[PDB]
Symmetry: C2
Subunit: 179 residues, 2 copies
């Protein structure tokens, strides 16, 4: 059954729609460079011990620095992966952070509509393939690595407000299935 990691004050959970409103100063980051350990981001999903392909359509109102919305894959508090859009110096970026004791993040240009995009995560064997889409048809690769956690993987939708509060993210067309 679906459950939360840092359940937010405000939210909505329907059969085919999930809304996460971030709490103040929420984020996910481990040590690397910044020297702090944040594990306060919001994630709604479920644990699974089998391979899978997760896909979701994200609609959030990015505005404050470091606003994040996308997907999350958890193992432990020091073994997880997050990916999606992140606001910074205006322009929106698409990136990913793989944390295996330490956070390793990559980022880059996001061409689509920052307020309406798709995310896809495929986890078969010990491999993690993360892709995104701006039209729901084309899925460019974002990150390809090997899972840093164990058997149990927590897969779900995520939302972060490192410098603010209230980022509202709507998740629809959610589909968790065999790879």
């Amino acid at each position: 059954q679906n459950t939360w990691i840092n359940r937010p004050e405000y939210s909505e959970v329907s059969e085919d729609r999930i809304v996460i409103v971030s709490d103040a100063n929420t984020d996910f980051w481990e040590n690397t460079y910044y020297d702090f350990s944040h594990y306060t981001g919001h994630v709604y999903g479920k644990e699974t011990e089998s391979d899978f392909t997760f896909q979701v359509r994200v609609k959030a109102d990015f505005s404050a620095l470091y606003d994040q919305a996308g997907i999350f894959i958890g193992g432990t508090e020091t073994a997880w992966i997050k990916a999606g859009i992140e606001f910074n110096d205006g322009q929106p970026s698409i990136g990913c952070v793989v944390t295996n004791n330490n956070s390793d993040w990559s980022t880059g240009l996001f061409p689509g509509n920052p307020g309406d995009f798709w995310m896809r995560v495929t986890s078969k064997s010990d491999v993690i393939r993360i892709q995104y889409s701006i039209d729901g048809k084309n899925w460019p690769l974002l990150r390809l690595c090997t899972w840093p956690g164990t058997r149990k993987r927590f897969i779900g939708v995520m939302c972060c407000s490192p410098k603010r509060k209230g980022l509202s993210a709507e998740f629809t067309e959610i589909l968790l299935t065999t790879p």
Copy 2:
């Protein structure tokens, strides 16, 4: 003193210019997904045990699938990092691969001129910050992680031809210095 990792058949080494012509089927990759271990890419540089900032201007004639040219940071054969342009399905991408026993790669859109760009690597403490530039003035972030190797880091220019032979890459404006 400067030395090679998989010295190529053809090359040129001047005081302020380095040309690497790739040998057939050369590449850098460790296990993840593809299930093969490649350590045949060409790298010209030097070992250092102190923090540094490396910068270089790259001019290569990308054409065959997976053609790569950029920078490399080595620790061991299972602990290294590479970053730069990579040709694929025509369009050129800017990406990075961090290998800590297993390769973890990120990729994305490259807006500049694929045949003339800059790379910058900063290694202070145990942090690695990789940036690129399309005009030699602006340096967007590409990857930020913590070094997977030890004290001795091999920093230098790199060139790969996974599916061909002959990719000629020219490296100029090389500058290795304190961060």
